[PDB]
Design an enzyme around this catalytic site. Structure first.
Site, short mmCIF file in Angstrom:
data_model
loop_
_atom_site.label_atom_id
_atom_site.label_comp_id
_atom_site.label_asym_id
_atom_site.label_seq_id
_atom_site.Cartn_x
_atom_site.Cartn_y
_atom_site.Cartn_z
N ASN A 10 -28.54 22.72 11.58
CA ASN A 10 -29.21 22.03 12.68
C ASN A 10 -30.59 21.63 12.18
O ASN A 10 -31.48 22.47 12.05
CB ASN A 10 -29.31 22.96 13.88
CG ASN A 10 -30.08 22.34 15.04
OD1 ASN A 10 -30.41 21.15 15.03
ND2 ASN A 10 -30.38 23.16 16.05
N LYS A 12 -32.79 19.93 13.72
CA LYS A 12 -33.75 19.85 14.84
C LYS A 12 -34.49 18.51 14.74
O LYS A 12 -33.94 17.51 14.28
CB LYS A 12 -34.60 21.10 14.92
CG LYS A 12 -33.76 22.36 14.99
CD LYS A 12 -34.59 23.59 15.27
CE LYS A 12 -33.70 24.82 15.29
NZ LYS A 12 -34.47 26.07 15.56
N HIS A 94 -28.31 24.96 22.93
CA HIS A 94 -29.28 25.63 22.06
C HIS A 94 -30.43 26.18 22.88
O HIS A 94 -30.81 25.63 23.92
CB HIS A 94 -29.82 24.67 21.01
CG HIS A 94 -30.58 25.37 19.92
ND1 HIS A 94 -31.91 25.70 20.04
CD2 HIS A 94 -30.18 25.84 18.72
CE1 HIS A 94 -32.30 26.34 18.95
NE2 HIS A 94 -31.27 26.44 18.13
N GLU A 96 -33.57 26.20 22.51
CA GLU A 96 -34.68 25.28 22.75
C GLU A 96 -34.41 24.37 23.95
O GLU A 96 -35.34 24.03 24.69
CB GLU A 96 -34.99 24.48 21.48
CG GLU A 96 -35.63 25.35 20.41
CD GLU A 96 -35.25 24.96 18.99
OE1 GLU A 96 -34.79 23.82 18.77
OE2 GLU A 96 -35.46 25.79 18.09
N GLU A 166 -27.10 33.28 18.86
CA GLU A 166 -28.44 33.30 18.28
C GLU A 166 -29.35 34.14 19.16
O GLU A 166 -29.70 33.71 20.27
CB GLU A 166 -29.02 31.89 18.14
CG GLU A 166 -28.13 30.92 17.41
CD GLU A 166 -28.90 29.71 16.96
OE1 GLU A 166 -29.13 28.82 17.80
OE2 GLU A 166 -29.32 29.66 15.78
N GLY A 172 -36.23 30.96 14.20
CA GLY A 172 -37.45 30.46 13.59
C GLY A 172 -38.54 31.48 13.35
O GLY A 172 -39.64 31.09 12.94
N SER A 212 -32.80 32.98 11.68
CA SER A 212 -33.44 33.44 10.44
C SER A 212 -32.45 33.83 9.34
O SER A 212 -32.77 34.67 8.49
CB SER A 212 -34.55 34.48 10.64
OG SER A 212 -35.41 34.13 11.69
#
Length: 249
Positions: A10, A12, A94, A96, A166, A172, A212
């Site tokens: 991904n 992003k 996701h 985000e 996730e 991140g 990560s």
């Protein structure tokens, strides 16, 4: 049948024409374990460039789409448009988008159902917050997020879904889930599928870990019996992405 190992990248909100041409040229020149299914998700405006330039054994994904086939939704794309352009996959839910853009469990579920109806395959993202992890509630959270999708899709619909677990606190941050932590969640997800959807769906659905993952920690995660691959964020912009695809050697 063994579940086919799956690695998604991904990107992003990152890339230019030149930088993406370089990312694709590195993927085109690397020797990838031919038993691994690889999917790449560029920003939407670069989907035509990536589908054109990328080796055809790696499929392309969009990072989001909306819930309808067409209409008065300025700024939104339909899964029908993705199908029309030969983009076979979409990432939905996701963290985000659940956080910054307020996508609820039910909105994600509606997106998953419509994308499948439009002929796409879906990487469906779930995962608990730092607080939920600290409270010991990861299993109840993922169960809730899965239940919303199960309420909208059929048993047969799961054949074109990959579940991406996730932990939000791992996205991140450089803080990866340990093999024990990830394996426990993946086992709980698979058990939830067996009891709530079917044993067949539980044994066939890929459950991939993200948050990560890097070239060093990927090998031991890939050895866990309920981890079927990875959803890779920042490292998919780096050469080590090849090592992650090749995590099983």
């Amino acid at each position: 049948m063994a579940r086919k190992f799956f690695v998604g990248g991904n990107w992003k909100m990152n890339g230019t024409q030149e930088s993406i041409k370089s990312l694709v040229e590195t993927l085109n020149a690397n020797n990838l374990d031919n038993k691994v299914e690889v999917v790449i998700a560029p920003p939407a405006v670069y989907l035509p460039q990536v589908r054109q330039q990328l080796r055809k054994d790696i499929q392309v994904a969009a990072q989001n789409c909306y819930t309808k086939g067409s209409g008065a939704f300025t700024g939104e794309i339909s899964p029908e448009m993705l199908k029309d352009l030969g983009i076979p996959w979409v990432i939905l839910g996701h963290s985000e988008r659940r956080n910054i853009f307020g996508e609820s469990d039910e909105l994600v579920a509606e997106k998953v159902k419509h994308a499948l109806e439009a002929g796409l395959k879906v990487i469906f993202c779930i995962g608990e917050t730092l607080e939920e992890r600290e409270a010991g509630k990861t299993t109840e959270v993922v169960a809730r997020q899965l239940k919303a999708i199960a309420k909208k899709i059929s048993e047969s619909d799961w054949s074109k879904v990959v579940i991406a677990y996730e932990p939000v606190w791992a996205i991140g941050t450089g803080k990866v889930a340990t093999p024990e932590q990830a394996q426990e969640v993946h086992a709980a997800i698979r058990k939830w599928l067996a009891s709530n959807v079917s044993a067949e769906v539980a044994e066939s659905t890929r459950i991939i870990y993200g948050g990560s993952v890097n070239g060093s920690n990927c090998a031991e995660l890939a050895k866990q019996p309920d981890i079927d691959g990875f959803l890779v964020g920042g490292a998919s912009l780096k050469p080590e992405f090849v090592d992650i695809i090749n995590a099983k050697k």
